[PDB]
Amino acid sequence: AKLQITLTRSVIGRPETQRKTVEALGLKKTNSSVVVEDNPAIRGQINKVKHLVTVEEK
Amino acid sequence: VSSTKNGRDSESKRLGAKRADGQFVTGGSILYRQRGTKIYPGENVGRGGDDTLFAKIDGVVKFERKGRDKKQVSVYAVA
Amino acid sequence: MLLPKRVKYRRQHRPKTTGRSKGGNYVTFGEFGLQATTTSWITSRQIESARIAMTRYMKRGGKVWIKIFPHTPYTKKPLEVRMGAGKGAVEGWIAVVKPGRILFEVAGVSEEVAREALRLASHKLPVKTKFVKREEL
Amino acid sequence: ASLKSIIRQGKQTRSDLKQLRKSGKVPAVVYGYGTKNVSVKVDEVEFIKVIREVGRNGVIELGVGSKTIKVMVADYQFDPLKNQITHIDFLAIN
RNA sequence: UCUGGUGACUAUAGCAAGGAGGUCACACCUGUUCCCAUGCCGAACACAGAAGUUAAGCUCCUUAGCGUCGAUGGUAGUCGAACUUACGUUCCGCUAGAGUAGAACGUUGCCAGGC
RNA sequence: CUGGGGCGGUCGCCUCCUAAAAGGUAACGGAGGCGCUCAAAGGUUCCCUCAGAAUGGUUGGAAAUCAUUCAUAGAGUGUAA
RNA sequence: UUAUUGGAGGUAGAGCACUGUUUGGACGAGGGGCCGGUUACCGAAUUCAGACAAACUCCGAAUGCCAAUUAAUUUAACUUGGGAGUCAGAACAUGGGUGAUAAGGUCCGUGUUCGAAAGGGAAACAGCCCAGACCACCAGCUAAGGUCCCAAAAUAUAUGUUAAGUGGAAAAGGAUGUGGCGUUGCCCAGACAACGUCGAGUGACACUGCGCCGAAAAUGUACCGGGGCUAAACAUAUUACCGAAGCUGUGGAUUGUCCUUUG
């Protein structure tokens, strides 16, 4: 259905390829959040950067 | 007093593939640079004096096997 | 001692030491053997030193196999000169052993004599060892 | 000679295999005549017991689920350090 | 359905062995007068015919002998993460090479003749 | 230029490894070549297929030359790789 | 940026089919012991088994790269013109050369931080770990790291290990130090030692956790930061709190984007 994604860890100290994914997800500052529709593409983007975010079934 | 007899190299030649499989090209676009024929010319593809492979028409690129252990490139028209 | 008659290149890069043993992990010629448990280079002076020690305790009774040969040359510079004006001259020949590689094999003696001779030989080597027998089952 | 088995369910991850081997259990597979491939597991000490009695080339009454299958041991991987069997193949013999 | 010509396909098509077939094909086969030709040889090439032969080439059936193909399961290596300075450990994805079971003594298009 | 400077070596071009399976990539890192040649060793049209191994055979330096079988380039390709 | 799909290429790893290196054992051909030949011995070939490679390859990943889609999220990219500064870089992690598998050494590839970055932790400590300061506040929640006193928060709940102040600086080796886990011997018909009694356990091996010795430097205790600790040490699990200029709450400043009440 829907997901809620929250940026729990900071992005400094991380490789740039992961920063680009965090920006493409739409998250900006630490603890900021978005709501998105579940897709295989969205799940791949979450999987790449999962040590930085938390997901809730919404 | 010791020295070495080795010090030299030649400039690198930028060989290898220049266009992608599935990409649309124009008339005389270079597809592959090489010494000898690691890849043969297929359909609508010529071979230059330095073994360079190039397109002869506009179309899309297709790399594909030739026999048991050989390769070729072709270009197909409509796109 | 042991060294190849000829090589294509006299100055080679040094081997990789991390990892586990690639092959030669079983006794195949004799009936007892010495298995390595840590990693090191063996320098072809240590091989001769350990072979002499092991072959005289057996009073020329049995047979010995050396499952190791030094194929790689290493270099070294003259006495402490400045850095970097070419690579140095050849000084020795080494073999690289990793945990699991059988080093020697004996046959034709009692298990007791074999244990003692291999123990004597293992004190001349820069690697921790372990007495093993020909596998079964 | 009679060994009993348990069927491994799908997709064991490497931690599962590691915990399995940290017990006395051994991953194995059974394939061949009159059977489809089945992934099983076997206890180590019982396997050593029955093999020390039937010999390297002998028949075993392996029990798989509800069936029992005459079988012979085709191959096995072995850790020379740690001295432990780590995988076995079983071959149905018709 | 058989044979032939001519194509497509990574030898699953190959090599080896055994056994059968011919006037419908094909080949061996007859000869060198002519077209033509052989560093010499009508061996090869080319031309002229149909006496013999299935012996061979070739076609059909048998075999897995060599070559080729080849899982599942496991292992090595490794992207990412977390511990750590250990010739390292733990978690999560991907996943070989070798080897084993096994497949395999080809599949198919167009045309002509024979059926 | 330079693991201070001097002394020694080097300075343009080609090929390979280092080079981390696209391309690129340093050190006074590891190995070699060039400063041409060919009137056919260029074009085209027809033919043809090796080294080597094996067994024989006057001369046989073992192998020169001849005959049969196997033989994937192991031959050959003006000149380094 | 990701999902899906297609493609180029020979690294890690493996392997020995080629080019080189190598250890055993056969087989035979040859020279050859002899009296031409036995046997020895010697060299070449074919074989069987087993190994090594930056400049070997019958094989061959993970990743990275090039592309295309009416795919999903996102906000850049390119062209032309005005104005620059830079061309001494450093440590850490990882793939490599050189050096001695030396250097806070030196030269390249790939990331991060410093440079040009305050705040919390690491005693102190550009480069390590957490985090990016618009300005008020005697509000709240968390990160790394922590909770006996210095000094904010557990002298907290369960299980176990250590006796060395190990914790709080090191090796080959040596050793009845003590837990855990298995396999297999001798068991009350009498071992296991002492000299018929002795009356129940007694061994080996394998595998592991934590400890001991090996362990000597120069101003003063002198690597736990100090006190001090037998847990306030170290495995496992639980769950409560403390903790930053991070996030939130309240007020304010500046600029922008939208709508537009120009708020």
Side-chain angles (χ1 to χ4, degrees), chain A, chain B residues 3-49 51-79, chain C residues 1-59 61-62 64-78 81-134 137, chain D residues 1-60 62-71 73-74 76-93:
Chain A
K2 287 292 195 42
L3 298 176
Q4 182 184 353
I5 318 301
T6 304
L7 180 60
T8 57
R9 317 259 305 277
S10 164
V11 83
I12 57 191
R14 301 298 173 170
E16 184 79 21
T17 180
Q18 308 183 2
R19 291 202 273 256
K20 292 203 241 212
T21 291
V22 160
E23 173 187 48
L25 270 171
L27 308 160
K28 295 178 288 182
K29 281 207 210 275
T30 310
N31 296 315
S32 70
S33 165
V34 293
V35 175
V36 289
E37 181 69 30
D38 200 341
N39 293 325
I42 284 293
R43 291 278 192 188
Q45 257 166 328
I46 282 163
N47 173 76
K48 182 185 180 206
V49 79
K50 67 174 141 182
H51 51 283
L52 303 187
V53 299
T54 59
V55 179
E56 271 147 31
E57 321 279 321
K58 180 63 61 62
Chain B
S3 61
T4 177
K5 291 175 171 293
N6 310 121
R8 66 206 83 84
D9 210 11
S10 66
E11 186 178 2
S12 278
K13 271 70 195 171
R14 275 73 156 136
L15 309 176
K18 309 285 156 183
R19 285 307 193 251
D21 177 285
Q23 192 176 3
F24 169 88
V25 308
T26 50
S29 303
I30 291 170
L31 315 171
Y32 201 87
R33 279 212 187 272
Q34 59 192 341
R35 306 272 82 99
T37 53
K38 308 184 79 165
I39 297 177
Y40 284 80
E43 161 164 359
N44 299 313
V45 164
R47 173 184 162 205
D51 308 318
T52 304
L53 268 56
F54 63 97
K56 288 183 171 178
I57 63 155
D58 299 350
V60 312
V61 191
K62 289 284 154 190
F63 291 84
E64 57 196 0
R65 88 159 64 243
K66 197 191 179 191
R68 164 147 282 204
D69 50 0
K70 288 178 174 179
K71 295 185 174 182
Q72 73 192 341
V73 190
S74 316
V75 174
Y76 294 110
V78 69
Chain C
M1 288 70 69
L2 288 188
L3 78 161
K5 293 176 182 62
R6 52 166 320 284
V7 295
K8 192 169 173 188
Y9 296 98
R10 299 292 302 270
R11 303 177 160 87
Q12 309 179 9
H13 289 169
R14 286 168 288 242
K16 193 177 189 176
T17 50
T18 68
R20 215 163 68 245
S21 179
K22 173 177 178 187
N25 295 145
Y26 298 113
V27 183
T28 58
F29 287 122
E31 46 194 357
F32 315 103
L34 194 65
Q35 184 165 255
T37 59
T38 64
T39 303
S40 180
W41 299 354
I42 317 295
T43 201
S44 170
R45 294 183 155 278
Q46 311 156 347
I47 294 185
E48 180 67 15
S49 170
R51 190 199 61 78
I52 286 160
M54 171 172 60
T55 191
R56 89 151 64 79
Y57 175 81
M58 284 189 302
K59 325 273 192 293
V64 186
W65 292 266
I66 305 160
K67 314 278 300 285
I68 280 297
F69 195 87
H71 292 109
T72 303
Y74 73 91
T75 72
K76 177 175 173 175
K77 286 275 200 153
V81 293
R82 300 263 167 100
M83 281 291 107
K87 203 150 151 71
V90 169
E91 192 163 84
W93 304 82
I94 49 163
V96 59
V97 312
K98 292 176 180 185
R101 180 62 72 109
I102 304 291
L103 305 175
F104 305 97
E105 298 182 10
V106 310
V109 289
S110 67
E111 162 158 346
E112 179 64 27
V113 164
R115 274 188 184 269
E116 191 53 40
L118 289 181
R119 180 198 72 97
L120 278 184
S122 74
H123 282 290
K124 307 276 196 275
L125 261 54
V127 73
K128 287 181 196 258
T129 58
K130 174 156 95 82
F131 187 85
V132 310
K133 292 190 286 184
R134 200 195 206 105
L137 275 68
Chain D
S2 177
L3 206 45
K4 68 181 179 67
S5 172
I6 298 175
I7 294 172
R8 299 192 279 136
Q9 294 302 113
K11 280 315 290 161
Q12 308 297 322
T13 74
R14 274 199 277 191
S15 191
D16 300 353
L17 287 158
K18 185 176 73 66
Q19 302 322 127
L20 200 152
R21 280 181 182 111
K22 190 178 292 294
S23 301
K25 294 308 189 78
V26 178
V29 73
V30 54
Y31 57 79
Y33 186 97
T35 183
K36 295 185 288 293
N37 281 45
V38 184
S39 311
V40 295
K41 68 175 83 174
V42 159
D43 184 77
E44 182 174 349
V45 299
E46 317 186 359
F47 177 66
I48 302 180
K49 295 288 180 68
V50 310
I51 194 76
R52 283 213 292 228
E53 191 273 332
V54 72
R56 170 61 168 91
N57 299 310
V59 188
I60 308 176
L62 184 69
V64 182
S66 296
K67 298 178 177 66
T68 62
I69 303 150
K70 298 285 98 175
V71 84
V73 53
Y76 68 111
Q77 300 164 14
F78 183 77
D79 196 353
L81 309 160
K82 295 173 69 66
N83 293 116
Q84 80 164 0
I85 297 194
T86 176
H87 178 103
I88 318 166
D89 303 350
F90 288 111
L91 172 64
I93 42 166

